[PDB]
Structure 1
Amino acid sequence: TFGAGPALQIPFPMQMAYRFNGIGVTQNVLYENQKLIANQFNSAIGKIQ
């Protein structure tokens, strides 16, 4: 939202549900796997270093 006008706040877990709906996956996939997805992101970030 901040690249197209004012910066409108939004919780990050709800932001990712927007981005899951953008790839054709429903948003109940994220909320019901939120802890797994959080752990996959943290592990994938730590492997970059």
Structure 2
Amino acid sequence: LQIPFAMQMAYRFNGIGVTQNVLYENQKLIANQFNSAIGKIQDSLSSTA
């Protein structure tokens, strides 16, 4: 069933017991923290065997 990705992430926030307005009010920060955390994994897997 399709759903917009920020609305899926808002359901994940309800699932951990965080009220979903906390996602929509911080969405730009949450996306930047996710994108940066995937970047650190490229660096770890590039640098270290």
In the TM superposition, what is the alpha-carbon distance from 1:20 to its structure 2 partner? 0.3
Runs (4+) of structure 1 exceeding 6 A deviation are none
State the secondary structure of the residue aligned to 2:41.
coil
Q: CA RMSD in A?
A: 0.3
Distance 2:21 2:40 in 1: 28
- State the percentage of identical aligned residues: 98
Higher helix fraction (1 or 2): 2
In the TM superposition, what is the alpha-carbon distance from 1:19 to its structure 2 partner? 0.3
In the TM superposition, what is the alpha-carbon distance from 1:22 to its structure 2 partner? 0.2
Instruction: Structure 1 unaligned segments of length 5 or more: list them.
Output: 1-7
What TM-score do you get using the length of structure 2 for normalisation? 0.84
Higher-Rg structure is 2
What do residues 16-37 of structure 1 show as CA deviations (whole Å, max 9, x unaligned)?
A: 0000000000000000000000
Instruction: Structure 2 unaligned segments of length 5 or more: list them.
Output: 43-49
Q: How many residues align?
A: 42
